[PDB]
User: Fold this.
Amino acid sequence: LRPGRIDRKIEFPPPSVAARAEILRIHSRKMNLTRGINLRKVAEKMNGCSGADVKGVCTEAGMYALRERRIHVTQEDFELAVGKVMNKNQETAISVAKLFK
Amino acid sequence: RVPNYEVSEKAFLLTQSKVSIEQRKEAAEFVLAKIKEEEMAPYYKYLCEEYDQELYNELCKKNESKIKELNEKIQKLEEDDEGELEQAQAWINLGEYYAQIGDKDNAEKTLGKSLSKAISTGAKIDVMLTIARLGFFYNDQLYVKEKLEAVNSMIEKGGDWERRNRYKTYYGIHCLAVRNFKEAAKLLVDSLATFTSIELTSYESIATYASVTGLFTLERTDLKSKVIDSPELLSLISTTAALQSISSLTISLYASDYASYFPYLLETYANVLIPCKYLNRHADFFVREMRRKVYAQLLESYKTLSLKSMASAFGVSVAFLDNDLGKFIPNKQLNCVIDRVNGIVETNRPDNKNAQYHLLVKQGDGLLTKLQKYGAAVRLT
Amino acid sequence: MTDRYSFSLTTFSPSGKLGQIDYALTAVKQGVTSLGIKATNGVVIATEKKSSSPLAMSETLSKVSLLTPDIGAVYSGMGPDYRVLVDKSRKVAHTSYKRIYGEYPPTKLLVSEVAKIMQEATQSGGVRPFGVSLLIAGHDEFNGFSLYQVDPSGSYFPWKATAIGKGSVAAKTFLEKRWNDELELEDAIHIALLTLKESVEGEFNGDTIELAIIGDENPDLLGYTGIPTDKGPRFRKLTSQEINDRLEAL
Amino acid sequence: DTLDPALLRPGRLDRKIEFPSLRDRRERRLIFGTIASKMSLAPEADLDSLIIRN
Amino acid sequence: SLDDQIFVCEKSIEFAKREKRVFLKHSLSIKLATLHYQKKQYKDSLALINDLLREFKKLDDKPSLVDVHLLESKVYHKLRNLAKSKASLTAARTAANSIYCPTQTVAELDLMSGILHCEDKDYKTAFSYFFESFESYHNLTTHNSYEKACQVLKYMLLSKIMLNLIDDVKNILNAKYTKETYQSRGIDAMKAVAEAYNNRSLLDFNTALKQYEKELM
Ligand SMILES: Nc1ncnc2c1ncn2[C@@H]1O[C@H](COP(=O)(O)OP(=O)(O)OP(=O)(O)O)[C@@H](O)[C@H]1O
Assistant:
């Protein structure tokens, strides 16, 4: 904490929607590309909170193609996948609070 | 673009004199309506052989019209300052005019200008394919072959998953059209799921063709999983007559009722194989194969049968059976001989040690040929 | 365990949230599942009662006490804190509004006066917070049917719907799905029974379940008929038999 | 929430299963069914009365 | 029948979008979705559902859209594809996260998941859903839920034939209300085939399905 020899400090924000578009794009390319190219929509509509968040979206959208026994994703799947991942993040984190203020 | 496949299949019924006189002229009225609508004067000259000069004046006119329209446009666009983008979009509209009139040659030329100025890699692949389509329209398969080769170079250069789905169907049609029905069986069953409607032979047609390639190639076991229980074929139901005829055939094979199989075979030959252009040439290949495959399955379940019994089941004469089977035996799938006098069809199939001997001796002989050729070569050099 | 600052109520906690106040909430949770639903034309409050000893009389355990004849209360928590707090509510109200303004309080004013008492058992050091959190459901003319929560801190809030106790989670969501304020009262009573029925299924008999409404006047229960202008009692407590009727309507 | 929620979180732990312990009728009914299978029971009283009472 | 029904619907869908609420337009589309299903037109019934559907992805939650998914589920079972029958059970369940939905909404929810596992050759899972549905239908007003109580009673019976436990065929069958009010030809059908399966008499099974032939049908 106190002076010594630490000097450089780099601050990392949690992603913005622009940055989120980038992370999401490149994983989708490697995997199966989002059809109708609404991966841009998904990032514009909402922000996640982490790039960890974003890789979770990637996995789930792909799992939805697996249940049908399809091997390709569509926009319909990302729209389901996002709501599930992101909402779950909020319900685990809010429970701690009672009813203060 | 879109009218070309519709025009050509109608033109092909008219060409044929096999089909019912009714269908031939029913098709005459229909092809005529689209001939006028699209102005097909250069292309009418190809079609009139194979079975008004106004169509030509209308042509030439359409020429100076649609021909001029694009010209002066193209020029204002080359003057105006954004070279890469604007000129190339306009050259895409240029290729559309030649493509309307059924001239595959000039369509190739202007669409080449379009590519020339730099456009999106994905966009280049859309363009190559457009040319490719016009190769089916003439029925020049050699033309399609080379066009489709240039697409597969660019398919993974781009990463395009979007254009990969189209390529699957076009390549399905390519393989279907050619004599190799092996690749076709694979390419087309996966084009069912990934069907892209845009400039291609209807969804109903694809589904029928998949079944055809299914039946030729795939084992009894492998038909059940991939074609019968195939979730899409069941989603699409049987509505069109051709789908019904081919589908019903599949079913009675598995269920091994051979009272209803041979009537269905007659139906599929009339209404499915002969009128489809691709399967007019392959009618012979497909029907000879079906006869051998059904008879092979029945022989496997019997050490011995009567000729009267095999025949009676089919609903063909003892005489008829005797000739048709003796065509199929020397090609060797049936694996049987017929005692005429006793009338028995005895079945002799190896499954023993002999199987594993033949495979070994043949493969190992193929290897030795290669050792000799290559060894002797390297010594000299 | 916690700090000596947070046990003290004369001492700002590090967090600034007393340990104390938090203990009061742990106890509220431990008690019964009590609820309140607001209707156009009524308020229904309903709760389950402690089974206690086998030979202990159930009737005498009362978790709904009428504060005035037109305004009732319901709580989760301990008996002793409840009764003492309750005598204080009535008493402070008489002084400050039944002699001054010579009439029953507005619901809002009564709720305000109950918070203040609460607040003083949290301010003064060495005197623990009331062990109980209320719902004060009521009816007054000016502001119609009204529904409140009063916290042992001494903050109060009006609600559309609230429930407290162990089964608070469960209940609140059920009310949402099935009902909204604009719906009539009659529907809510059937609904409230079902909600409380998730809580416990061994017995749901009308003996162990205390159900009341604050709604319309009853000019019969005015008790000095022949004068009509005086409002009758708004509150009417529904007997066990009456509950059982309402169970066959579910 | 025994685990830190910010640190240990979805996409390490992208499935986080809550088990019913308050439980539904069906869920109860299956557990009684493990027993009902294990040994025959001589019907002498309502079977379903027991479920509801749990 | 067809003619009367179809003409009325069309005419009715125009008044709503010209002077009244877009809500009213949507209620009439649930009627139209049911009408196509009864014609055994499953292509037409999916196409109709889909025209709406995008604008009601927004509004997805309403008990009325819970019923649209449930119908979709039905529509794919009869088309005999189980890829999307499974897919459409999930949607129904999403849009009833709160399971506190009306009695009829709940009956149909349980019963689709049961039938789905019938095809999946699990008759532990199938049986359990049927039971919950059993109870819903009896406690419902018997407008036509008395006939549909019977259909579930046969499905309960059906599971236990497969598992070849004839003890539980006698257990279900009681004089409480099963052989009384929910008695059918098909109650007798199920217990007869059940005794034939147990003995190992294919001969007995063949006799049973001649006289219970309309039950298979
Ligand atoms: N009296 C002093 N003598 C020397 N340098 C000083 C003095 N006061 C301030 N400094 C400044 O502080 C800078 C860094 O000192 P440095 O951080 O190496 O020192 P320290 O006190 O030995 O600590 P640590 O090992 O915890 O970093 C020096 O380079 C110099 O600029």
